[PDB]
């Protein structure tokens, strides 16, 4: 699986236990040193962002290589696998450990390994079940917003409604004398004022109750493990169902199956097959991240509190009202039942191997895998809707097929020469292939609910053009590694690899990589008689690795269709082309030290790494005068340097008690070395960041000083200039030359985590914490809720009432008619400490199952996920983001009770 001198972190099955999410990488936030995992949505159909030893490139992806049982997969396919089938998870964060897997092995690989049946004479059955709820985890951002009449008085005073207008003249006949809108619709012209009050100036509408809910979560599973004299099997079926926390629907529901099987046919051949399948239903809330008027957390913060989405009985209405609108705005349940969507995906993973051992020593091994998924989605827009722009309805069907095949063949030969010189050779071949496909077809113009096939729409100007997409790639690799070992205390590993990809041109597709590593067992040679210490191994490595994750057709100079008339065709220039595109080459030096004391009762590991990346694939931004947005190129280089260290112990006292703890830490320092055009620095436009030589990608902002107490204007520091009294010079006119690079970082430098666990006679309690410090984020929601210049129709912060006037002069918030800039007062400290899980179990005593041979195990749980976070970021979530906090889906706080009957 990996070398002996490598950097391997193995996570056991108990940390991959029942977790009530489909995103399995979020269960590893804080369990591996160096590997940092951050997810950006509480969406059930969300996929985590993993980075091992910092970011390695700027254009290509820095995701690891996810491998489930030899053949390599993607995280969406892993999301349809039952997590109760996984035996362990090895993370190989080295250049000598990742030397037989290569497609993006410079980012590290993640080896998921599935469970196999133990070989007892009586098989094992296990029935798991669970049920829980999920809620929003933060409410503090809407604790300092305005109320209804307070916002109306603030708007009337600031001159938004009129130049000479009062509160009653605005609230009476301008935006409450808009029964003129509700009197145009037959469904609700007799409900205004009777059971439907859309504008209510006396209460405050709870907009959090109208946009977010409490969502259930269920899972069930049943597994049969067994094994006779030669064969072994693990079969399993189960289902998972998670509902969306937000009122805009986004669920996840899968029915799974798994059959791992292994057998020894004779004394010469051993065969095996581990094959799985799934039927899955996804849906995503695709409005989070954009700023629409009444949607998301931006909608729970900014909607005025004198607009009522509820009826008189407390239920959610079908429509609400915003002033100036020409049709009523639909709420999220009505918009969900008038725009249906349904997906259905069928996934199958077939995977098999055969080992042949002809002579003593060498074993040949052949392995082949197929990964097929057929997805089929449907969308509607329902006819005869009164609050729509048309009485006609539309429909759209889509069919996806993604097929990925793989073949891999090794031949290992191990031997000794005299007594203590054990060599091992390994040569091998690897071929990966992929071919995807998308077909789509829509229709529109339907007038009935029942008559809505695609062949029943209008046939004139209501026709449209279908959809078709094709993608494909391939990889071919030849590798060989050699392990030499002395008697007990010296191991030396040497490996060569040739990689060829389909993503690069025919003269640049092949690259050669190598790795040399070593391990020295100091305890078994020098200090073999000791009182306290019990293990000491030193290990070091150096190897070069490639990265080839850009896109499939990024090196051709292409010409596409662009039709002008309907009589002839027309061609346009599509891309620019780069004939000299090739791999990105990362050389990593590693040096570690792994101790151990009190015979297992203190383990400590310390690592050091460099990881220099050359010929870095940047999607370089061409100037706008070329007519192209960007183009992939091999220009630039960027360094890292880091330490990471973990230590675990056991501090129990009595026979009954069992107390253990673990701690885990990583720090690194990014550094860019060469950009792309002879440039010293490059600022990414309206993102807030900058790439500079000798620094990480820092933030690039103006510095906010305060306000001017004599006139009320905002003030910014002039960079570089110092006044005569030592103070820094300010100015009140904004310009783009007031911006400078500030000493923050987009990628956080310090990650870590720590775990505690106590036990008793049965009753056990485990608590896991994760933390990230050094993380800053631009709070983009505070641009909208803390400005008096524009967007006065929305709800504002409560601090915009002590604004600078001619009477109120000693204050801190500026005058009204000013737009704010994106400067250092919108940059916030998003450094958090979470409580990831708090599982409390109680395995039932073995004396309870005495005469009955039908049962023989039972456990219960009381699990709470994300129930505590400590940070100083005021934006519903510090983890859900990365460079900005837009209209975001916050994470979930979940309470789950389960049961397990093992019999």
């Amino acid at each position: 699986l990996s070398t002996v001198s490598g950097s391997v972190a193995k996570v056991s099955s108990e940390k991959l236990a029942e977790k009530p999410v489909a995103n399995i990488m979020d269960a590893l936030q804080g369990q591996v040193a160096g590997m940092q995992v951050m997810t950006t949505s509480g969406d059930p159909t969300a996929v985590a962002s993993v980075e091992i030893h910092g970011t390695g490139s700027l254009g290509a992806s820095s995701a690891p290589l996810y491998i489930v049982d030899g053949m390599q997969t993607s995280l969406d396919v892993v999301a349809t696998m039952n997590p109760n089938d996984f035996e362990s998870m090895s993370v190989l964060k080295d250049a000598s450990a990742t030397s037989i897997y290569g497609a993006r092995a410079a980012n590290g690989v993640v080896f998921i390994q599935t469970k196999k049946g133990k070989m007892s004479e009586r098989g094992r059955i296990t029935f798991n079940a669970s049920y829980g709820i999920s809620q929003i985890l933060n409410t503090k951002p809407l604790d300092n917003m305005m109320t209804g009449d307070e916002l109306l008085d603030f708007q009337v005073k600031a001159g938004f409604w009129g130049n000479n207008q009062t509160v009653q003249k605005v609230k009476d006949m301008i935006l409450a004398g808009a029964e003129d809108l509700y009197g145009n619709y037959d469904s609700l012209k007799d409900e205004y004022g009777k059971t439907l009050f859309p504008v209510d100036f006396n209460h405050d509408a709870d907009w959090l109750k109208a946009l977010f809910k409490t969502a259930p979560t269920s899972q069930g599973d049943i597994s049969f493990s067994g094994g006779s004299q030669g064969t072994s099997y693990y079969a399993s079926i189960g289902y998972f169902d998670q509902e969306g926390m937000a009122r805009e629907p986004a669920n996840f529901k899968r029915y799974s199956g798994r059959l791992n099987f292994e057998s020894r046919i004779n004394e010469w051949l051993k065969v095996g097959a581990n094959l799985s399948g799934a039927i899955a239903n996804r849906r995503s809330a695709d409005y989070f991240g954009k700023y629409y008027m009444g949607s998301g957390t931006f909608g729970v913060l900014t909607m005025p509190r004198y607009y009522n989405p509820f009826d008189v009985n407390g239920d959610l209405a079908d429509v609400y009202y915003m002033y100036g609108a020409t049709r009523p705005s639909m709420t999220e349940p009505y918009f969900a039942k008038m725009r249906p969507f349904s997906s259905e995906s069928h996934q199958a993973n077939v995977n098999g191997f055969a080992q042949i051992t002809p002579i003593k020593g060498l074993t040949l091994k052949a392995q082949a895998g197929v990964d097929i998924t057929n997805t089929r989605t449907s969308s509607k827009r329902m006819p005869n809707n009164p609050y729509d722009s048309t009485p006609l309805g539309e429909r759209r069907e889509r069919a996806y097929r993604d097929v990925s095949k793989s073949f891999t063949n090794t031949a290992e030969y191990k031997f000794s020469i005299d007594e203590k010189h054990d060599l091992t050779a390994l040569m091998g071949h690897e071929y990966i292939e992929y071919e995807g496909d998308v077909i789509g077809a829509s229709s529109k113009g339907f007038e009935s609910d029942k008559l809505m096939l695609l062949s029943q729409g209008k046939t004139g100007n209501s026709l449209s053009l279908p959809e078709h997409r094709v993608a494909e790639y391939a990889y071919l690799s030849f590798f060989s590694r050699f392990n030499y070992g002395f008697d007990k205390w010296m191991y030396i590993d040497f490996s060569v690899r040739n990689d060829q990809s389909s993503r690069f041109g025919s003269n640049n597709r092949s690259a050669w990589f190598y790795s040399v590593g070593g391990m020295f067992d100091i305890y078994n040679k020098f200090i073999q008689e000791s009182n306290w210490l019990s293990d000491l191994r030193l290990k070091m490595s150096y190897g070069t690795t490639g990265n080839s994750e850009i896109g499939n057709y990024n090196h051709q100079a292409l010409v596409t269709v662009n039709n002008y008339t309907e009589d002839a065709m027309g061609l346009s220039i599509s891309t620019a082309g780069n004939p000299d595109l090739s791999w990105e080459k990362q050389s990593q030096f590693n040096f570690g030290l792994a101790a151990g004391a009190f015979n297992n009762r203190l383990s400590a590991e310390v690592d050091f790494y460099v990881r220099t990346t050359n010929d870095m694939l940047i999607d370089v931004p061409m100037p706008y005068i070329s007519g192209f947005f960007s183009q992939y190129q091999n220009v630039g280089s960027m360094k890292n340097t880091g330490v990471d260290l973990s230590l675990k112990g056991t501090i129990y006292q009595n026979k009954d008690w069992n107390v253990y703890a673990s701690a885990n830490f990583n720090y690194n320092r990014q550094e860019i070395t060469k950009l792309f055009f002879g440039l010293n620095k490059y600022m990414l436009p309206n993102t807030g960041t900058i790439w500079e030589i000798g620094y990480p990608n820092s933030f690039y902002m103006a510095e906010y000083a305060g306000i001017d107490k004599k006139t009320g204007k905002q003030l910014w520091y002039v960079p570089g200039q110092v006044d005569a009294d030592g103070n820094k010079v300010t100015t009140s006119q904004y310009s783009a030359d007031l911006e400078t690079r500030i000493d923050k970082s987009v990628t956080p430098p310090i990650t870590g985590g720590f775990s505690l666990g106590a036990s008793w006679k049965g009753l056990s309690l485990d608590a896991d914490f994760a933390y990230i410090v050094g993380k800053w984020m631009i709070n983009n929601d505070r641009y909208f809720t803390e400005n008096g210049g524009g967007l006065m129709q929305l709800n504002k912060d409560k601090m915009l009432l002590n604004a600078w006037t001619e009477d109120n002069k000693e204050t801190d918030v500026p005058k009204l008619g000013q737009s704010p800039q994106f400067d250092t007062h919108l940059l916030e400290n998003a450094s958090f400490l979470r409580l990831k899980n708090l599982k409390l179990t109680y395995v039932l005593p073995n004396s309870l199952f005495a005469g009955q041979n039908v049962i023989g195990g039972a456990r219960v749980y009381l699990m709470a996920r994300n129930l505590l976070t400590v940070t100083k970021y005021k934006g519903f979530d510090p983890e859900a983001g990365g460079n900005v906090g837009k209209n975001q889906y916050p994470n979930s706080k979940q309470y789950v009770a389960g049961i397990q009957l093992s019999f």
Binding site: K290, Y292, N686, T687, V746, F822, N883, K886
Partner: peptide
């Protein structure tokens, strides 16, 4: 939704 409100910053990484 409707009437997208503006002056947002683009997100790299």
């Amino acid at each position: 939704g409707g009437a997208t409100t503006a002056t947002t910053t683009t997100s790299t990484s």
